[PDB]
Structure 1
């Protein structure tokens, strides 16, 4: 189906027994009433395309995913900056992604790093991908920055932004943003279930970054992560959320102060 649909010429009917406009909705099915079994239409050939509305063209946008700060002070400094990789931090890509239950794709992370007031000095950075189970680096001159059996990218600030391709690395067959269950066994409390809905097969390690130098660098960088989806497959479509997001890794909403799905009108018998 490279185009939308064509309409065949129709005419009028005056006879009993054939009722196409009485599709019962109690059956759970969608009404299959076409134009040709209704008001008299003409012959039109439609050449409008359906290529843009596909999933692969709908999820091939980058969007912002994470913002990582790097203070690099002089007396209360940290040096490194870890950031756990998750996409449920910015409600735009999350709202676009949470209209399905199970997804599977590849990523094209792009890292854009700038300075506080805005400037690009030729300082060399080091982006490190720490998988789950590998030790996290503690310090700007730690032992973990040797990057042996560990992927890393060396790029400067004046260079174009780096861009690496990340495969599908979940231990299960697909991703899922809705896990109605519990990660452990035993007795579960009733007051505060901080373990309910915790997606087990979604953790993907921690992203790290430091500045390659000896002493220090009096600068405050701020890098942004842009993740593009590709080779994506979606299952079990879910309705789109109509409530404002409130938490990072828990779908919640305000019990009072509920937002309606539509705006208000003056009267029901008025279209304006």
Structure 2
């Protein structure tokens, strides 16, 4: 329980209880009222005085949503750009619209609630590889540029937008990490994990996806020039939430996700409730 807190040992778990022959029955309830009665074990059995040596601190939503999780894995390489028309398709640079709903493990922890508001902590890890024949490992530097909506998008890896006089960017080495903090950047007072609405009253506009859970976008490149070989740099973005506030606890999702921002689930999906190996009376 959490009713009474003592002095010699605090926050009793169960109080000492004895036999009952009484006209008040705490275990008879109506759940047609939409309420859960706080029935303790001392209302049904005879109990002994035990204490909680527990605070309930790891189940705080600051702790629950506040560890780093991989939200995006993208890939760029450092090759010769002479003769390439599309630098994005050749992955000389690559950008990512920031969302926390692409790894489903963080997405389920987020979508236990309807609205969440937090400051963001990003950690970006870059690891290289040379799958083709090479004489050495290149000493490469990655630029991650945080591109807000309405900012000019990069067309090439050596394009003028990478100079970033207003856009925040970070320059770090491959094999290392870059860690930076981004505040709560929602237009409203909280992000929307779910949106039962549209951008406007239109018959062909998109459902559910919204700029209420818009968190910006970051674009990646390698600042170095090309070598004799080709080296592939894999970039993993890690997000840690902090100063978390959350609202409206929702039902957990059991069917798999299919998209970003949609609640859609695949057709002909498998049953998620485990069928009993026997009948209902079987343990």
TM-score normalised by length of structure 1: 0.89
1:138 pairs with one of 137, 141, 155: 155
Question: Which residue does the alignment assign to 1:178?
Answer: 194
The verdict on how the C-alpha distance between 1:5 and 1:97 changes in structure 2, with shifts beyond 3 A counting, is: farther
Gaps of 5+ in 2: none
TM-score normalised by length of structure 2: 0.85
The verdict on how the C-alpha distance between 1:120 and 1:63 changes in structure 2, with shifts beyond 3 A counting, is: farther
Gaps of 5+ in 1: none
Deviation at 1:211, TM superposition (A): 1.6
For 1:88 and 1:260, locate their aligned partners in 2 and report how far apart those are by CA, in whole Å. 21
> Is contact 1:120–1:157 with CA below 8 Å preserved after alignment?
no
Question: Greater strand share, 1 or 2?
Answer: 2
Deviation larger for 115-124 or 194-203:
115-124
Deviation at 1:243, TM superposition (A): 0.3
Aligned positions, number? 264
Question: Which residue does the alignment assign to 1:91?
Answer: 104
Q: Give the CA RMSD over aligned residues.
A: 2.3
Following superposition of structure 1 onto structure 2, how do residues 210-221 of structure 1 map, counting pairs within 5 Å? 210-214=221-225, 218-221=230-233
Question: Which residue does the alignment assign to 2:210?
Answer: 199
1:149 pairs with one of 154, 166, 169: 166
Deviation larger for 70-79 or 260-269:
70-79
Q: 2:282 aligned with 1:270, yes or no? A: yes
For 1:26 and 1:215, locate their aligned partners in 2 and report how far apart those are by CA, in whole Å. 70
For 1:83 and 1:46, locate their aligned partners in 2 and report how far apart those are by CA, in whole Å. 46
Question: Which residue does the alignment assign to 1:56?
Answer: 62
Deviation digits for residues 74-103 of structure 1 (CA, Å, limit 9, x no counterpart): 444622211111111111111111110000
Question: Which residue does the alignment assign to 2:21?
Answer: 14
Deviation digits for residues 227-272 of structure 1 (CA, Å, limit 9, x no counterpart): 001100000000110101122332212343342333433111110x
